[PDB]
Ligand SMILES: OC[C@H]1O[C@@H](O[C@H]2[C@H](O)[C@@H](O)[C@H](O[C@H]3[C@H](O)[C@@H](O)[C@H](O[C@H]4[C@H](O)[C@@H](O)[C@H](O[C@H]5[C@H](O)[C@@H](O)[C@H](O[C@H]6[C@H](O)[C@@H](O)[C@H](O[C@H]7[C@H](O)[C@@H](O)[C@H](O[C@H]8[C@H](O)[C@@H](O)[C@H](O)O[C@@H]8CO)O[C@@H]7CO)O[C@@H]6CO)O[C@@H]5CO)O[C@@H]4CO)O[C@@H]3CO)O[C@@H]2CO)[C@H](O)[C@@H](O)[C@@H]1O
Ligand SMILES: [Ca+2]
């Protein structure tokens with residue numbers, strides 16, 4: 001019999017949970033609170049004609065994938081930024097509060113959709129148009145597809161026009177400075193063959209932020225969208241990190257420091273959100289927990305259930321080069337947040353890309369649930385998952401927070417102290433709505449693989465809870481079903497045993 005005590009103090013550690021941590025990049029069979037238009041294809045995207053390059057993902061084709069994959073109407077395929085408007089209309093039509101858009105920064109964008117771009121056609125060539133941030137002239141809601149340029153600030157304008165600015169309801173709140181620059185020369189060699197440098201990146205960002213913050217002072221700028229650890233530390237061995245990184249624990253500090261400095265010189269904040277991508281290197285059972293990992297492998301599934309700990313748990317060492325050789329930077333969330341504090345306070349933090357694998361397995365769903373619990377508890381501002389609708393259990397973890405009863409029910413927005421006696425076998429997050437603890441929401445995850453877990457809840461609230469309804473999903477179905485309610489609460493205390501590998505959302509009320 002595995003017994004664990006859960007302790008909650010509805011009046012301690014009260015912190016708001018950003019509503020934007022529950023987002024996605026792809027369209028999911030779930031309720032998400034933010035949609036991001038980013039990733040490899042977005043780097044060479046041309047708003048004037050909607051053409052883009054698959055880069056190395058696929059023979060360097062310039063084509064209409066984004067119009068196809070986006071579900072755009074062939075009528076609009078020629079309409080400027082149709083791809084992005086279609087993207088935002090769909091978003092708005094689902095009452096999704098936040099739309100992040102990626103702006104082109106690598107330097108060039110598809111001039112056509114004629115297909116393959118020969119190495120000989122490496123930019124600049126007739127296959128591309130040169131991207132420029134500021135137009136230095138009057139914008140036109142009818143861009144000139146014939147010139148040799150594409151203006152980013154004019155791009156925002158076309159948008160801020162159609163939807164109003166970032167302060168308006170229907171407006172687009174965020175803009176990202178491209179996608180994974182440290183990998184530009186790997187993913188888009190036909191656009192930026194040389195390895196981006198620390199100076200170049202900082203320089204282009206500042207340029208782009210200003211260009212944009214003059215078309216919409218209220219818009220939020222995300223950056224740099226680093227693909228993974230290597231870019232966090234040295235911008236993937238940037239050619240000038242040796243000189244630039246002088247006296248910097250890692251590139252993250254450097255970026256935050258220079259963006260800050262630049263912001264002081266400009267007289268206004270240029271960096272709104274530090275944006276990084278996080279794909280667990282956490283290994284188990286021979287393979288990595290994500291990127292095509294086999295759910296038959298019980299050892300990897302078990303490694304996945306513990307992987308989330310790397311985000312906050314200072315006592316957890318995952319099996320990976322990062323756990324093995326990067327302990328000075330783990331847990332990663334505290335370190336990233338810790339860095340924001342030293343070189344640019346007030347700066348938000350977003351994990352615009354992440355996937356813990358097992359998307360169609362119970363553990364994929366518990367990990368996702370646990371990850372979402374961590375983002376809210378540590379102040380993450382926005383998070384958009386990467387993966388499609390086949391990930392039924394991942395979609396399950398998200399709904400546990402955004403729509404657990406199928407009718408719009410959701411986790412509270414104010415996190416409260418909530419401790420577990422055994423973090424290895426379980427996880428628990430608790431919240432209330434605003435400053436009112438009349439209803440205490442609790443996410444309770446039983447990581448015990450094949451044996452049940454009994455939980456002893458002792459809550460310290462101003463209210464007396466007499467009932468506790470339950471919703472949950474498990475190895476039985478990725479569908480969240482209501483369960484028998486808790487009714488024997490004595491002085492805000494009860495015992496609830498939960499089946500193996502189960503994720504539930506409890507809701508207590510007086
Ligand atoms: O096909 C359908 C349509 O597709 C369309 O295009 C799609 C794509 O299909 C879709 O995938 C894409 O979605 C993308 C998204 O757009 C991207 O944002 C991103 O994709 C990225 C990944 O994020 C990225 O990870 C991946 O490659 C990574 C890889 O994942 C990493 O694992 C790897 O990391 C390396 C690391 O660099 C290396 O250094 C490390 O080993 C070192 C370690 O770094 C070092 O520190 C350590 O040092 C120790 C040392 O070991 C020790 O001895 C000594 O004593 O101490 C020192 C420390 O002091 O040593 C170790 C070695 O021991 O190893 C790791 C790997 O294990 O890096 C690579 C990159 O290089 O790349 C992709 C992009 O290519 O996410 C999504 C994909 O997941 O969306 C597209 C559309 O937008 C087409 O357009 C259509 O046409 C198609 O139809
Ligand atoms: Ca043009």
Ligand SMILES: [Cl-]
Nearest residue numbers: 180182226227
């Ligand atoms: Cl990067």
Ligand SMILES: [Zn+2]
Nearest residue numbers: 029389390392
């Ligand atoms: Zn699905």
